[PDB]
Amino acid sequence: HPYYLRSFLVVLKTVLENEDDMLLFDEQEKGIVTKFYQLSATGQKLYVRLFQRKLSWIKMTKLEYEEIALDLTPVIEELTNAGFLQTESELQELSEVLELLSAPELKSLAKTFHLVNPNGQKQQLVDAFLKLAKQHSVIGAVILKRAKALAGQSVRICKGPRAVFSRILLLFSLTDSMEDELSTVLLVNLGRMEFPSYTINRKTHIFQDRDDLIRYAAATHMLSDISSAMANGNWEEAKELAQCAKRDWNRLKNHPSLRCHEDLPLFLRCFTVGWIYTRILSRFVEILQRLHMYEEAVRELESLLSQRIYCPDSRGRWWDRLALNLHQHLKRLEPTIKCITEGLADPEVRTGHRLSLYQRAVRLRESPSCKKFKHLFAVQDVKHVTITGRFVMVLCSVEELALAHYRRSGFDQGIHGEGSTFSTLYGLLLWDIIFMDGIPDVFRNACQAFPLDLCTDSFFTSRRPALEARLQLIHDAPEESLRAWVAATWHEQEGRVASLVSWDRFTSLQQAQDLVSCLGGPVLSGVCRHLAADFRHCRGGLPDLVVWNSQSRHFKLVEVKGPNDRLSHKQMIWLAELQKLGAEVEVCHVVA
DNA sequence: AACACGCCTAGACTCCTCA
DNA sequence: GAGGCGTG
DNA sequence: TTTGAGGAGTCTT
Ligand SMILES: [Ca+2]
Ligand SMILES: [Ca+2]
Ligand SMILES: [Cl-]
């Protein structure tokens, strides 16, 4: 089986064995999946090749697949019988036949049918052919017959069966996505990936019925379209699309299904239509801000912050952003102070957005403009250091240069991993708690790299006594214990796809063992507590470098900065917090 | 010099059709 | 979201 | 005529 079919069969098996997910398919749709498994390998191979391509008519001219068969005529015929794949005889709409033809093929057609401009562009010829065929039905039937003859043998994928596989992938996709935005990396690799072993346990339903899923899926397409508009810098298209989404979401706000969604725990409530429209409303405030409609942007941010149902984790980003627009763009210092107060009060705002609001506070208590207002009332200081480059040493990064400085300054051993180094160690020390039994709805299918609550407050609370026991054990751990825990997870789990664990991060198991030994129990314990407590807001801002001396076991955690980049809020909080745990932290600056 | 802010980024590549 | 570049 | 920017396709055993 080649990579594309391997990946497809994994996706299918994973979703079908899920009884509760299969409630969202009528018995005919389940029949189409049964029909696919009754196909030959070559039938399956070819269908997947066409499934991955644009939903459009394809000339058998253009269909080459050496690894399937030399001629695909019997393979197409199997898929035709099964009802997966139309042929010439089904191609009847004139618009569709004209699209399928080449510019020279339409030119010679336009000569025979005496069009006004036979040397015109394809679309003009197509629009012209459609006008003629409409006006004079008799001619239209000749155009259709003439076009189909030039078109030759061609084939299209049936939208009915396609839609069943689209929905299977949509259900499969939910659990692969840890962050917000078949996909390429999975299409290629998914067949070969071995996943952590855990116990699937589904107490709760995500979608009420088939109609609920279709409305989710539609909002997903709308979210996808809005992002693509913003990506291509078509900010007017995006505004209307976001306005359509706001209308479509407004129409739906009464529907009974939404009341079941409100009752889902946050780690499942992400997989609900209302969450997707809320995320579209986050994209809307982004578009309004780019079009300099800051009054309009602030209404939507106030609207979003007025509820706690959908995207609580985004509230930190919303408050910080509301404070900015009221302060710098609208110049309303009285709302700014209220916004910041309500912001800093809210226990959903964390780390960078917490600090950023507090930094905007100390900028107003020490500002002549806000003397007419009341009193209006931190981070620890860190050793900054400077070195020099030309960058070359031949061509090197800012981090590679700093590593050589720490190598010359005695630290023979070093890793430039940013957040992956502590994330992997966190994954390696707490694997068995990460994938532990007895939390319902967190393991729903066989291809998860994480429990669905990992990036939620639920993760720590749901595992509170087990984590506290391990966190304390790690704090009081001799190097023999740390080396043994890392070794246990390594030898049992090496290669297993876990979101937290980059297996290639450490050059060997020995390097992982050597590093935890230098870091020590108290440091590792505190890092693991933070990442377990609130991965969503503590994942980012860990320092670029760990450097350590292989004899002394002196180590520095270093955030490398080039000429023009300051500490982010999340970086300076991590430096302070690693200093409190009693590790030497440094900002290694670089200059020309 | 520093700092706060807006803005853009989005995989890497082949091949071939047609403005 | 995070990072890189340009602006005042 | 002559051509190259953009879109569809492809990627891992
Ligand atoms: Ca690090
Ligand atoms: Ca850096
Ligand atoms: Cl991006």
Residue numbers in the entry: 372 to 509, 519 to 561, 571 to 766, 773 to 785, 797 to 799, 810 to 1008
The publication says:
FAN1 (FANCD2-FANCI-associated nuclease 1) is a DNA structure-dependent nuclease ubiquitously expressed in the central nervous system and peripheral tissues that plays a role in resolving interstrand crosslinks at replication forks. It possesses both 5′ flap endonuclease and 5′-3′ exonuclease activities, allowing it to process DNA structures that arise during replication stress and repair pathways. FAN1 comprises a DNA-binding SAF-A/B, Acinus and PIAS (SAP) domain, a tetratricopeptide repeat (TPR) domain that mediates dimerization and protein-protein interactions, a virus-type replication-repair nuclease module (VRR) containing the catalytic site, and an unstructured N-terminal region. PCNA is a homotrimeric ring-shaped DNA clamp that encircles double-stranded DNA after being loaded by replication factor C (RFC).
